[PDB]
Design a protein around this ligand. Structure first.
Ligand SMILES: O=S(=O)(NO)c1ccccc1
Lengths: 263, 1724
C-alpha cells in the first residue's frame, strides 16, 4: 500500500529511438538478399532489378514503417520479354506496418519519359505466402487513376525483413484482382471478397551487370513519417536526379531537434 | 639488443605541478607558526633587499646602444635586473636563462633580446627588413598572450614592428604570419604549427625564441616546452642556422638543469636573482585548515577571510582570488553581508569621502547586476564572463584606489597589470574536467596571483595570504620560498611526442630517437637525480650516459605506437615507418589511444548515432565519470536527445555524448561540474571531429564524410542541420528566425521572392528588405560542366564555379573555403576531392577546375559533383553529371605488328661515307629501324614512326636525311623538336655526324631573327624549336628559303597534346599547306611516342597507312619492367618521407650494381634525397657501395666544385643535379655518372628533358610539384613521366630497363592506363587561335571568314573534332555540326582581333591586316601585348615610360614571383634610376621593370634573379622594336629615337648618361675617370692613341688589351653621305626622295660584341628623317649593313618654303655610333 511508502517516477522511453538504433544496422542485410523462386514460372515478363538501388532502398528504410518506391525501366534492345528496372523514384510518403500512403500524382519528369512505369517496390516487416489485400487495393486504384499502368506489365515487389536478411518476391494483378481492388474500401486485413486468384507471381532476378539510379523530390525529402500532418493525398511535387536520404536523417525529423532545444 | 619494456605509467609523477620532490623545507629567519581552532598559520616576514653588489649601478638608457634607445623611450634608467642583464642581452647572442621573482623585470630583459635581433636587420634607409626574421614569444596563458601583444606592440611601434597573436585555425589564416615579425603564442600553438612543417613555411625565419615562465616544465603542460626545445636545438644541428633561446623562470631549484636544457653557458647566460629582488617585499601568511568535514571547513574559510579583511578595511585594498566565475560574487556577498551584519561596512568608505560619490555615480551608470549590487559598498568582482568595458571600469576604479575589496579569478592575475597591497588566495582547490576531479591550483597560477601583492610605487610592503588545507602547507611554503624543484613530466607524453618527431621525419629510427631524447629536460633530470626517475645509482654507473635506459624508453614508446597503428616499428633494425593515422594524430594534437579507437570503429556504414558514440570514446575524456548527483539531470536530457544513445547512463561515454548534444542545442545545465565538463568536451570536439573528418575524407567514404563535416559545423555554429541557416548571421533576431522555422517551407524558396513576398510569407513586412539581403549574403555557387572524354575509361572534367552571392567582408572575411567532392552513382565513394578557396579579390569571377575520373562500360547513369562550404551549415550545391549523352571515343586500332626481320647491317646503306657514321658504334640497327629502313631510305613518302622513347627513332629521321643528301646536292632539311634542351643535344650529335664527318652545314636556330634567316640559307640541317620556326615560316611567301625545304622532320610530335602543343600543330599544318601550294612536295617525317590515335596524326600529315608505323609500348627494344607503387599519405612532405626508404630498397632490389637515376619534385629535394640514400647505405649491413672509383681518382674532380655537400655525397658515390648548379658542376656530375664512377644521381623534375645520361633503373619519387605562383601542387604532365621513364634504357649495356614510380595511391590507376597502353593526344589549338589567325591575315592566306574555316580544315584539331566531339564541345559529328562549330570559332577570333584593332572587317565577311597586326605578326608578339602598347605609348613617353610599358607585356606575365625577395626588390627600387609609380611589389610586370633597371645598371644579383633576367632579355629586343615601329608610324620623333637608344642600352647593359667606354671589355669606373680627365671621352679616342699613353691610362693586363682591341676592331665605323634627289624642282605636296649611302670601312668580321647580352646579335640600323622642332618623324627605314648599302627615303612635301630637316643614323646594338646631319630643302 504505497500511498507514501514507495513512489517511483515515470521516465519516458520513446519508441522511435529503438527503431532508429535498429535502422542503423540495416546495411548488414544488404549482403543477404534472397529472391523467391516463382510458383508461376511463366508470366511473359522477367524483371531484372539492379542490386545497387535495391541495397540503397533497404538502407534508407525502417523495420516497422513501410516505405515504397516507384519502378521505371525498359526492355533490353532485342528482348521484349525482359524488363530491366533502371530507376526507383522516391516521392513524399508515410507508412505503417501494413501499407504505404503515396500522393495521387505519379512521377512526372522529362528524364523518365523514355522509360516505362513498371509498378512499385515496398518493404514489409514480415514475409507472407500471399500478396497483401492492402497491396492489391493500392495497385488497383493506381491503375484505375493512371492508364499508363498496364495490368500485364506492372508489378509489386515486396522486400520482407527475414531474420538477418531480406527476401524479395514479385507479383502482378489479374483482371479479377484489378476489378476487386479498385472498388475495395475496407482497409483491414480481411476485407470481403479478397481471393488469391487476384494476383500471380512473376519472375524476378537480381543483377550486378548494370546500375540503376534514384530520383527524389525537388523541394523536400521523401520521408514524411514524422511530419504526417504536412503530407496530403493531393500534394504535388517535382523531382530531381539525386540519391535519397536514409530514414532517420536529421531533415526527416526536425521536431526532435527543435523540441530538445526547447528543453 | 637486450631491450626491456617499461611501464611508463609507473614512472609518471601523478600530481603534475603539485609534485614535491624536496623532502624538507627551510623557512627564512623570523618565520613563526601559530595555532588556532581547526587551523594553523605560518607567517613569513618580508625579506630585505640585498646590499648593492660589487660594481652595480643602474644603467641609464643613454648608455644603451643607440638603436635600442627607442625601445626604452620614456624611461630614465634600467632597474637592477636589467642593468645586470643588458650586456648579455643586447651585446651577445648567448642563450640565456633568467630566474627572478615575479614582477622583477624579466620581460624587459626579453625586450632587450628582441631589440638585439631587430638591430640585426637595420636597412641603410633606417627602416627594418621586417621580412628577414621572425621572433617567437611563448607565454603559458592566453590572457598573458594578449597582454604581451599589446605592450610589446606599443614598445616597438617606432621600429615599424608588427606584434601579433596567432588567432584561430590557420587553414586559411596563415597569411598574417608573413606580416607579423613577433608572434606571441602558447606552447601548444607553436607545437602544433611546427608539427605540420611542410615547405612555404615561415618557421625557417625564426631567429629568437623566448620561453616565458619556463618553470611550466614542472606542469603537466611542461612536456610541450621540452618538445619545442628539443625540436629547435636539434633543428639547429641538421640545418646550421642558429636560433637564440631565452628562458624566463621563477626562482626554483634545478634552474641549472634548465640551463643545460637550453644550452645556456652557466658562466655567460645564467642569471639567478633570489626573492630579495622582488619589487615590493612580501609579508606572507599561510593558513592551513585541519577540519576534515566540508560544511565546518567552509564556514572556517569564510571566517578566516573576514577576519583578514578586517585587518585591512580603510587602510589597504584587498584583492581576493577564487577559482570560479560564480564563486567570485558569492564570496564578495559573503564578506559584504557579513560586514553589514557586524556594522563595519562604514570602515571601507569613510563618510563624505570623495570616492563614495564616484562609486554611487559609476554604479548607477553601469549595467552589470552583481556589480551594481556591490559597487556602492567598495566591493567589486572581475572575471571573463563579464563585458570588456565592465572589466575596464573595474580596473579603472581599483587603480584610482576607489574599490576596497575586489574578488576575482586567475585571468585577472595573468591578463591585467593590477597590483593590490593585500592579496588573499581563498582556498587552493579547483575543478579539473581533464582530471575529472578537484585538484590543487597549478604552481604558475599561485605564483602569479601572489606576485600581484604589493604595488610598485605606492607600497613599502605587500601582504600575501594563502588559505589551503593543512597538509598542503609544506607544498605552498616550498613553492613561494624558492624550494619547489622543477622536474620533468614528460614520461607520460613520450609516445605522442615521439610520434610527432617521426611524422616530421626528424626521427627515423630508435637511434635518432635516443639522440632526440638526449635534448629533453627529462634526460638532464635523469642524469642528475636518477633515483627520482626510477633509475638505481648502480644502473646509472653501468650506463653513465643513460644510453641503455633511453633505448628502453624509446622501445617501450615505439611499441605502444606500433600497437595502435600510428607507426610501423621494426624491432630488429629499429626503423620507424610513418603512417597516415600517425600523421593525423600529430597534426591534430590527438593522443595515440584516441586514433586507435577511431581506426577501430570508423566504418563507411556508420550512422550518426555511432559517430557520436565514437567521439565520446576519445581518450581525452578517459577521466570523466558520471557522478551520482548528476544522474537525474542527465536522465532528463538522455530521455530527449535527438541522436539516440545506445548505452546506459551508468557509462561515462553516454554522459559525454549527451553533453555534446546539449552544447549543440545550447542548453544550460545546473551542475557546476556538468557545465565545466561540457566545456572541456566541446573545446576538444573541434579538432577531434576535424581529425575524424580528414580520416574518412581521405578514405573516400562519401556518406560518413558528409555526416562528419556536418558535425564539425554544428559544433562550431552551435545549431543542428534541421534549423534555419539564417541563424548563422548572428545579427538577425533569434525570435524572427524561430518564426521562419515554424513556417515549414524550404529556405531555397526565398531565393526567387523579393522584399514583398518575403515580408509577407513570414507575416512580417518590416523585415522584407533585411532578410532579403541576408539570403543573398549566404554563400551560394552555381556549377556547370564540360565533359572531355580521354579514352573509353578515363574522363577529363572541366568544372566551372560561378559565385552567385553578394560578398561582404563583415560576413565572409577575405576568403571562403569549400570542398569539391566527385561521388559515384550511389553517393557512396568519393572518386575525387579537392579544396577550393574563393578569395575576396575573385568573389565575382568564374573559376575553372579540372580533374580526371574513371568511367566504365556500360556507362553508369551519372556521377555527382558536390561543392560544400567548409564552415557554413546548409551550404552546398550538387550538380548531377549525367552520361546519357556522353559520346565516347572509339576504341583504338591494334598496333603495327613488329615484323621478325633479319637485323639490318650498317652496310645496307650502300655508301661508305654514310656507313662511317655508325659502323663503329653497332653492327646492326634495332628491329624498328630495320622495319622502317626501306620506306625511309628508299622512298619519298611522308612517314610516321610511333614508338616508346628509347626505341631509336632519331636514327630513322637520319635515314631520311641521308636519302636527302643522295637525291639532292644542297638539299635542305628542317628538324623540329619541342624542347630547347633536346635541340641542343641533337645539334651536338648531328654537327658531328653531318658536318664533321660528311662536310655539310648543321645549324641551330637561336631565336634572333636575321641570324636564323642566314643559318637557314647556309645549312643543310636546320635544327629548331617550334616558335623559332613559326616566326620564320610565317613569312614563307616572301622567303624562298622556307618553301625550298626538301625534308621537314618533327620529333616528339605527341607533344602537340601538351601545353605548348598549338605552335607545333600550327607549323606542321603550315608545312603541309605550303607543300600543296608550291606543288613540289616537301617530305615530312614525324617521330612520336606510342599513340593510340596514331592514324589521325599520320592522316593529318599525309602519311600512307603503309608508311605509318604505329608501335605500342610492348615493342621497346630494351624491355621495360615497370612498377607503380601507391602511397596512401595525402600530405606531401609526409608522403615524401614515407618514400625515402623505399627508394633505397628499390635500388638494392632492382639495380644493386647498375646505374640509377632518381627524379625528385624540387631542387631542394635532390640533395635531401642524396643524403638520405647515403645514410641508409651506411646503416645497411648487407653493405652496398655506389662509388666505383677510389678517393684518389675523385679528388681532382672534387676540387672543380663549390658546393660542399655535393663534394661529400659524390665522395660516397651519389651525385645530384638541379637548376642551381653551374653548368660546369652539372657536366662534371654527368661525367662521373656516365663513366661509372658514381652509381646514383638524384635529379630534379625540371631537368628531365636536358639530361645527357641514361640509367639501368629510374625511380620517380612522387609525381607532383609545388607551383608557387598559384600556391598549389600540380601533377606531372604525362609527357614528362614518359620522358623520365625513357631514361631507363641502355641498349649497349643492359638486357632490360627498370623503373619504379612512387605516387599517391589515387594516381596509380591513371599511370597504369597511360603507361602500359599507348597515349591518346588531342589538339588545344582552339584555345590558342588569335596570334596565328592574325599572322595568316597579315600574310594574306586568310582574307575572309570562309578562308578561316578552310584554314582550320588543315589542322589536327579539325581531324580530332570528328573523332572526339565532346572533347571540343561538339554534340555531333554532322557536317553542319562542325561547320557551325568552326564558324563560331572563326567569329570569336576575328571579332577579338578586330576589337584589338589588329584587323579590319568589311561587310562582316572580308578581313584585312592593320598596322598593329602586322607589327604583332612580324615580331612574334602576342596581340594583347601590342594592343596595350598601342594604348600606352604616346608622343612624349621616354626611357622611363618605355621600360614601364615593355615590362607590362603578356610575354613576361609568367616570370617567377616569390615573395622571398619582396624587400630585396623593395630596396632594389631605391637603387634604381627611375622611381616607379605606386609600387606594388606583388606583380611580375613591375618585378621585370626592376630587373630591367638592374641590368641597365650592371647590378650583379642572385643566380635565380640572373636566369630570370636572361629570360626577360630573350624577349626585350622584339618588344622594343615593336615599340619603335608603333611610335614611328604615329610620327613621334623623340620617343622613337629613345626606344632605339633603349635597344642599344639593353644590348650593351648601360644607360644614356653612362660613358661610351663602359662598353669596352675590362673597364671600370676608375678607368673612365682616368680617361675623362686625360682627353678621352669616346671609344674613337682610344684607337687614336699611341700604345704607350693608351696602356698608361689603361692600367690593365695584356690579354685584356687584346679584348679591348677586338671590341674596337668590330665597333661600327660607318661613314654616311646623303643627297636630296632633285633639290631644285621641289613642290609642295609632291614627292621628296632622299638617298643615303652607307659605307663601312672594313668587312663585317662577325656579330655584335655584347658579353652581357645572352643571344648573339647582328647589327641593326635605322635611317630617320625628322623635324626635331616639331617632334615629327617623317621617314624611317631599317637595314642591315655589310660593306656598303644605299637606302631611299620617301616623304610628302610640306606646305611651301624652306624647311630644315635632320637625318639620323641610329644603331640598335651599340651606344655612341649614332650620326646626325641637318639639311635644308627649298619647296618652291
Ligand atoms: O594532356 S593530358 O590531358 N595531361 O596529362 C593527357 C592525359 C592522359 C593521356 C593523354 C593526355
Amino acid at each position: 500500500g504505497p500511498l507514501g511508502s514507495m513512489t517511483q517516477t515515470f521516465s519516458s522511453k520513446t519508441e522511435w529511438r529503438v527503431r532508429a538504433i535498429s535502422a542503423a544496422n540495416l546495411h548488414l542485410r544488404t549482403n543477404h538478399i534472397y529472391v523467391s523462386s516463382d510458383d508461376i514460372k511463366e508470366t511473359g515478363y522477367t524483371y531484372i532489378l539492379p542490386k545497387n538501388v535495391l541495397k540503397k532502398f533497404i538502407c534508407i528504410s525502417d523495420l516497422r514503417a513501410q516505405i515504397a518506391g516507384y519502378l521505371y525501366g525498359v526492355s533490353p534492345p532485342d528482348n521484349p520479354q525482359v524488363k530491366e528496372i533502371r530507376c526507383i523514384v522516391m516521392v513524399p510518403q508515410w507508412g505503417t506496418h501494413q501499407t504505404v500512403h503515396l500522393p495521387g500524382q505519379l512521377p512526372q519528369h522529362e528524364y523518365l519519359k523514355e522509360m516505362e512505369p513498371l509498378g512499385w517496390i515496398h518493404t514489409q516487416p514480415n514475409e507472407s505466402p500471399q500478396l497483401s489485400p492492402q497491396d492489391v487495393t493500392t495497385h488497383a486504384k493506381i491503375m484505375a487513376d493512371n492508364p499508363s499502368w498496364d495490368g500485364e506489365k506492372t508489378i509489386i515487389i515486396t522486400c520482407s525483413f527475414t531474420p538477418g536478411s531480406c527476401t524479395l518476391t514479385a507479383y502482378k494483378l489479374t483482371p479479377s484482382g484489378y476489378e476487386w481492388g479498385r472498388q475495395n474500401t475496407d482497409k483491414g486485413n480481411n476485407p470481403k471478397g479478397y481471393l488469391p486468384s487476384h494476383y500471380e507471381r512473376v519472375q524476378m532476378l537480381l543483377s550486378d551487370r548494370f546500375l540503376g539510379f534514384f530520383m527524389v523530390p525537388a523541394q523536400s525529402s521523401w520521408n514524411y513519417n514524422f511530419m504526417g500532418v504536412r503530407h496530403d493525398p493531393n500534394m504535388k511535387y517535382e523531382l530531381q536526379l539525386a540519391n535519397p536520404k536514409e530514414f532517420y536523417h536529421e531533415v526527416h525529423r526536425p521536431s526532435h531537434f527543435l523540441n530538445f532545444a526547447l528543453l | 639488443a637486450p631491450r626491456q619494456v617499461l611501464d611508463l605509467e609507473d614512472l609518471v609523477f601523478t600530481q603534475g605541478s603539485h609534485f614535491m620532490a624536496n623532502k624538507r623545507c627551510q623557512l627564512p629567519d623570523g618565520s613563526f607558526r601559530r595555532q588556532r581552532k581547526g587551523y594553523e598559520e605560518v607567517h613569513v616576514p618580508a625579506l630585505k633587499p640585498k646590499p648593492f653588489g660589487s660594481e652595480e649601478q643602474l644603467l641609464p638608457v643613454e648608455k644603451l646602444p643607440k638603436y635600442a634607445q627607442a625601445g626604452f623611450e620614456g624611461f630614465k634608467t634600467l632597474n637592477r635586473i636589467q642593468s645586470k642583464l643588458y650586456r648579455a642581452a643586447l651585446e651577445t647572442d648567448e642563450n640565456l636563462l633568467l630566474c627572478a621573482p615575479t614582477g622583477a623585470g624579466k620581460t624587459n630583459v626579453a625586450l632587450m633580446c628582441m631589440l638585439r635581433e631587430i638591430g640585426k636587420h637595420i636597412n641603410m634607409d633606417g627602416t627594418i627588413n621586417v621580412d628577414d626574421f621572425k621572433i617567437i614569444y611563448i607565454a603559458p596563458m592566453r590572457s598573458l598572450v594578449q597582454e604581451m601583444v599589446g605592450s610589446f606592440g606599443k614598445r616597438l611601434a617606432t621600429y615599424g614592428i608588427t606584434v601579433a597573436e596567432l588567432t584561430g585555425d590557420h587553414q586559411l589564416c596563415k597569411e598574417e604570419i608573413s606580416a607579423t615579425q613577433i608572434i606571441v603564442c602558447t606552447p601548444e600553438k607553436w607545437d602544433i604549427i611546427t608539427r605540420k612543417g611542410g615547405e612555404r613555411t615561415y618557421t625557417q625565419l625564426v631567429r629568437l625564441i623566448i620561453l616565458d615562465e619556463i618553470h611550466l616544465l614542472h606542469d603537466d603542460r611542461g612536456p610541450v616546452l621540452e618538445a619545442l626545445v628539443a625540436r629547435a636545438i636539434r633543428n639547429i644541428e641538421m640545418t646550421q642556422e642558429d636560433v637564440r633561446l631565452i628562458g624566463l623562470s621563477a626562482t626554483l631549484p634545478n634552474y641549472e638543469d634548465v640551463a643545460t636544457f637550453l644550452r645556456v653557458d652557466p658562466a655567460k647566460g645564467l642569471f639567478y636573482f633570489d626573492n630579495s629582488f622582488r619589487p615590493v617585499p612580501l609579508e606572507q601568511t599561510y593558513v592551513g585548515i585541519t577540519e576534515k568535514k566540508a560544511i565546518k571547513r567552509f564556514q572556517i574559510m569564510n571566517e578566516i577571510v573576514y577576519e583578514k579583511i578586517m585587518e585591512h578595511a580603510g587602510k589597504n585594498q584587498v584583492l581576493v582570488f577564487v577559482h570560479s566565475r560564480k564563486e567570485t560574487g558569492k564570496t564578495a556577498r559573503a564578506i559584504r553581508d557579513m560586514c553589514l551584519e557586524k556594522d563595519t561596512l562604514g570602515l571601507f568608505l569613510r563618510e563624505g569621502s570623495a570616492s563614495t560619490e564616484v562609486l554611487r555615480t559609476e554604479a548607477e551608470q553601469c549595467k552589470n547586476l552583481e556589480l551594481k549590487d556591490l559597487l556602492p559598498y567598495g566591493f567589486a568582482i572581475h572575471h571573463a564572463g563579464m563585458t570588456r568595458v565592465d572589466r575596464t571600469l573595474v580596473e579603472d576604479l581599483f587603480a584610482d584606489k576607489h574599490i576596497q575589496v575586489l574578488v576575482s579569478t586567475a585571468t585577472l592575475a595573468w591578463g591585467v597589470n593590477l597590483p593590490a597591497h593585500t592579496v588573499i588566495i581563498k582556498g587552493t582547490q579547483v575543478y579539473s574536467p581533464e582530471k575529472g576531479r578537484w585538484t590543487e591550483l597549478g604552481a604558475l597560477d599561485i605564483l602569479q596571483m601572489l606576485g600581484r601583492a604589493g604595488r610598485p610605487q605606492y607600497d613599502t610592503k605587500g601582504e600575501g595570504i594563502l588559505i589551503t588545507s593543512h597538509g598542503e602547507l609544506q607544498y605552498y611554503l616550498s613553492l613561494l620560498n624558492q624550494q619547489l624543484p622543477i622536474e620533468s613530466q614528460m614520461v607520460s607524453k613520450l609516445p605522442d611526442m615521439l610520434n610527432a618527431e617521426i611524422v616530421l621525419g626528424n626521427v627515423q629510427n630508435a637511434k635518432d630517437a635516443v639522440n632526440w631524447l638526449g635534448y629533453a629536460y627529462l634526460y638532464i633530470r635523469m642524469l642528475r637525480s636518477p633515483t627520482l626517475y626510477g633509475i638505481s645509482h648502480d644502473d646509472l654507473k653501468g650506463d653513465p650516459l643513460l644510453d641503455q635506459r633511453r633505448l628502453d624508453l624509446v622501445h617501450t614508446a615505439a611499441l605502444m605506437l606500433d600497437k595502435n597503428n600510428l607507426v610501423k616499428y621494426d624491432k630488429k633494425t629499429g626503423n620507424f615507418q610513418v603512417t597516415e593515422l600517425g600523421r593525423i594524430a600529430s597534426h591534430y594534437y590527438i593522443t595515440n589511444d584516441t586514433v586507435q579507437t577511431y581506426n577501430q570503429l570508423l566504418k563507411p556504414t556508420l550512422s550518426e548515432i555511432e559517430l557520436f558514440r565514437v567521439f565520446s570514446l576519445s581518450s581525452e575524456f578517459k577521466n570523466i565519470t558520471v557522478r551520482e548527483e548528476e544522474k537525474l539531470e542527465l536522465q532528463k536530457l538522455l530521455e530527449r536527445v535527438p541522436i539516440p544513445v545506445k548505452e546506459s547512463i551508468e557509462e561515462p561515454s553516454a554522459k559525454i555524448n549527451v553533453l555534446l548534444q546539449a552544447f549543440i542545442s545550447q542548453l544550460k545545465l545546473e551542475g557546476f561540474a556538468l557545465m565545466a565538463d561540457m566545456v572541456y568536451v566541446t573545446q576538444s570536439a573541434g579538432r577531434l571531429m576535424r581529425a575524424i573528418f580528414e580520416i574518412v575524407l581521405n578514405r573516400g567514404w562519401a556518406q560518413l564524410t558528409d555526416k562528419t563535416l556536418n558535425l564539425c559545423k554544428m559544433i562550431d555554429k552551435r545549431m543542428w542541420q534541421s534549423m534555419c541557416p539564417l541563424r548563422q548571421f548572428r545579427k538577425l533576431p533569434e525570435e524572427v528566425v524561430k518564426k521562419i522555422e515554424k513556417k515549414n517551407f524550404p529556405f531555397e524558396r526565398l531565393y526567387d521572392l523579393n522584399h514583398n513576398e518575403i515580408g509577407e510569407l513570414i507575416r512580417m513586412p518590416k523585415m522584407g528588405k533585411t532578410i532579403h539581403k541576408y539570403v543573398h549574403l549566404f554563400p551560394k555557387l552555381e556549377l556547370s560542366v564540360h565533359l572531355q572524354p580521354i579514352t573509353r575509361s578515363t574522363l577529363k572534367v572541366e568544372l566551372t564555379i560561378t559565385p552567385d552571392f553578394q560578398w561582404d567582408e563583415k560576413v565572409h572575411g577575405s576568403s571562403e573555403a569549400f570542398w569539391i567532392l566527385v561521388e559515384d552513382v550511389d553517393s557512396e565513394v568519393i572518386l575525387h576531392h579537392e579544396y577550393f578557396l574563393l578569395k575576396a579579390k575573385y568573389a565575382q569571377d568564374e573559376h575553372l577546375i579540372t580533374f580526371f575520373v574513371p568511367v566504365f562500360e556500360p556507362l553508369p547513369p551519372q556521377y555527382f559533383i558536390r561543392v560544400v562550404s567548409d564552415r557554413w551549415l546548409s551550404c552546398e550545391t550538387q550538380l548531377p553529371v549525367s552520361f546519357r549523352h556522353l559520346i565516347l571515343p572509339e576504341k583504338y586500332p591494334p598496333p603495327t605488328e613488329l615484323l621478325d626481320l633479319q637485323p639490318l647491317p650498317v652496310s645496307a646503306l650502300r655508301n661508305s661515307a654514310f656507313e662511317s657514321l655508325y659502323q663503329d658504334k653497332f653492327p646492326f640497327f634495332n628491329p624498328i629501324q630495320t622495319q622502317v629502313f626501306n620506306t625511309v631510305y628508299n622512298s619519298d613518302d611522308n612517314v610516321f614512326v610511333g614508338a616508346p622513347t628509347g626505341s631509336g627513332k632519331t636514327i630513322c629521321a637520319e635515314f631520311a636525311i641521308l636519302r636527302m643528301l643522295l637525291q639532292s646536292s644542297e638539299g635542305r632539311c628542317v628538324y623540329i623538336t619541342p624542347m630547347e634542351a633536346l635541340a641542343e643535344q641533337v645539334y651536338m650529335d648531328w654537327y658531328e655526324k653531318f658536318q664533321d664527318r660528311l662536310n655539310k652545314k648543321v645549324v641551330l636556330l637561336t631565336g634572333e631573327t636575321s641570324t636564323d634567316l642566314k643559318l637557314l640559307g647556309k645549312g643543310n640541317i636546320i635544327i629548331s624549336t617550334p616558335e623559332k620556326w613559326d616566326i620564320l615560316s610565317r613569312r614563307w611567301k616572301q622567303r624562298k628559303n622556307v618553301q625550298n625545304i626538301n625534308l621537314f622532320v618533327v620529333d616528339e610530335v605527341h607533344l602537340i597534346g601538351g601545353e605548348n602543343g598549338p605552335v607545333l600543330e600550327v607549323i606542321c599544318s603550315r608545312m603541309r599547306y605550303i607543300s600543296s601550294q608550291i606543288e613540289r612536295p616537301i617530305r615530312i617525317v614525324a617521330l612520336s611516342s606510342s599513340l593510340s590515335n596514331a592514324k589521325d596524326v599520320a592522316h593529318w600529315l599525309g602519311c600512307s597507312a603503309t608508311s605509318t608505323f604505329n608501335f605500342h609500348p610492348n615493342v621497346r627494344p630494351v624491355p621495360l619492367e615497370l612498377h607503380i607503387q601507391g602511397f596512401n599519405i595525402s600530405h606531401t612532405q609526409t608522403r615524401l618521407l614515407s618514400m625515402a626508404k623505399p627508394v633505397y630498397h628499390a635500388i638494392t632490389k632492382h639495380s644493386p650494381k647498375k646505374p640509377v637515376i632518381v627524379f625528385v619534385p624540387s631542387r631542394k629535394q635532390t640533395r635531401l634525397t642524396a643524403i638520405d640514400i647515403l645514410t641508409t647505405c651506411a646503416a645497411d649491413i648487407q653493405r652496398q657501395r655506389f662509388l666505383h672509383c677510389t678517393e684518389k681518382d675523385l679528388i681532382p674532380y672534387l676540387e672543380k666544385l663549390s658546393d660542399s655537400t655535393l663534394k661529400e655525397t659524390l665522395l660516397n658515390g651519389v651525385g645530384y643535379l638541379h637548376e642551381g648548379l653551374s653548368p660546369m658542376e652539372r657536366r662534371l656530375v654527368e661525367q662521373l655518372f656516365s663513366s661509372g664512377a658514381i652509381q646514383v644521381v638524384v635529379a630534379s623534375r625540371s631537368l628531365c628533358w636536358g639530361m645527357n645520361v641514361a640509367a639501368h633503373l629510374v625511380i620517380i619519387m612522387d609525381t607532383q610539384y609545388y607551383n608557387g605562383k598559384i600556391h598549389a601542387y600540380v601533377d606531372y604532365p604525362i609527357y614528362d613521366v614518359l620522358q623520365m621513364v625513357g631514361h631507363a634504357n641502355r641498349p649497349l649495356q643492359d638486357d632490360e630497363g627498370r623503373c619504379v614510380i612512387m605516387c599517391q595511391g589515387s594516381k596509380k590507376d591513371f599511370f597504369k592506363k597511360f603507361l602500359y597502353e599507348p597515349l591518346p593526344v588531342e589538339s588545344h589549338l582552339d584555345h590558342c587561335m588569335h596570334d596565328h589567325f592574325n599572322a595568316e591575315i597579315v600574310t594574306k592566306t586568310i582574307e575572309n571568314k570562309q578562308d578561316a574555316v578552310d584554314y582550320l580544315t588543315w589542322t589536327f584539331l579539325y581531324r580530332r573534332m570528328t573523332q572526339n566531339p565532346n572533347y571540343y564541345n561538339l554534340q555531333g559529328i554532322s557536317h553542319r555540326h562542325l561547320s557551325d562549330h568552326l564558324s563560331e570559332l572563326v567569329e570569336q577570333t576575328l571579332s577579338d582581333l578586330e576589337q584589338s584593332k589588329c584587323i579590319s572587317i568589311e561587310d562582316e565577311m572580308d578581313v584585312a591586316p592593320l598596322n598593329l597586326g602586322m607589327i604583332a605578326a612580324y615580331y612574334y608578339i602576342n596581340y594583347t601585348t601590342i594592343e596595350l602598347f598601342s594604348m600606352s605609348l604616346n608622343a612624349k613617353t621616354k626611357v622611363r615610360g618605355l621600360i614601364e610599358i615593355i615590362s607590362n607585356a603578356a610575354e613576361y606575365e609568367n616570370i617567377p614571383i616569390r615573395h622571398h625577395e619582396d624587400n630585396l626588390l623593395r630596396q632594389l627600387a631605391q637603387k634604381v634610376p627611375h622611381k616607379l609609380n605606386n609600387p606594388k611589389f606583388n606583380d611580375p610586370h613591375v618585378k621585370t621593370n626592376l630587373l630591367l633597371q638592374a641590368h641597365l645598371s650592371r647590378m650583379q644579383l642572385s643566380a635565380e634573379l640572373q636566369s630570370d633576367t636572361e629570360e626577360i632579355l630573350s624577349k626585350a629586343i622584339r618588344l622594343i622594336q615593336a615599340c619603335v615601329d608603333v611610335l614611328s608610324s604615329n610620327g613621334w620623333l623623340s620617343p622613337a629615337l629613345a626606344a632605339m637608344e633603349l635597344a642599344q642600352m639593353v644590348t650593351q647593359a648601360m644607360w644614356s648618361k653612362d660613358s661610351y667606354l663602359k662598353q669596352l671589355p675590362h673597364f671600370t669606373s676608375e678607368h673612365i675617370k682616368r680617361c675623362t680627365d686625360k682627353g678621352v671621352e669616346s671609344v674613337f679616342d682610344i684607337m687614336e692613341m699611341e700604345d704607350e699613353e693608351r696602356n698608361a691610362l689603361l692600367q690593365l693586363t695584356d690579354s685584356q688589351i687584346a679584348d679591348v682591341a677586338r671590341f674596337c676592331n668590330r665597333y661600327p665605323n660607318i661613314e654616311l653621305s646623303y643627297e636630296v634627289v632633285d633639290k631644285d624642282s621641289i613642290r609642295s605636296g609632291g614627292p621628296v626622295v632622299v638617298l643615303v649611302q652607307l659605307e663601312r670601312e672594313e668587312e663585317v668580321t662577325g656579330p655584335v660584341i655584347a658579353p652581357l647580352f645572352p643571344q648573339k646579335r647582328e647589327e641593326g640600323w635605322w635611317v630617320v628623317i625628322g623635324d626635331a622642332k616639331s617632334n615629327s618623324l617623317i621617314s624611317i627605314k631599317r637595314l642591315t649593313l655589310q660593306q656598303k648599302a644605299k637606302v631611299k627615303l620617301d616623304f610628302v612635301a610640306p606646305a611651301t618654303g624652306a624647311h630644315n630637316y635632320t637625318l639620323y643614323f641610329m644603331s640598335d646594338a651599340y651606344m655612341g655610333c649614332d650620326q646626325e646631319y641637318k639639311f635644308s630643302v627649298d619647296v618652291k
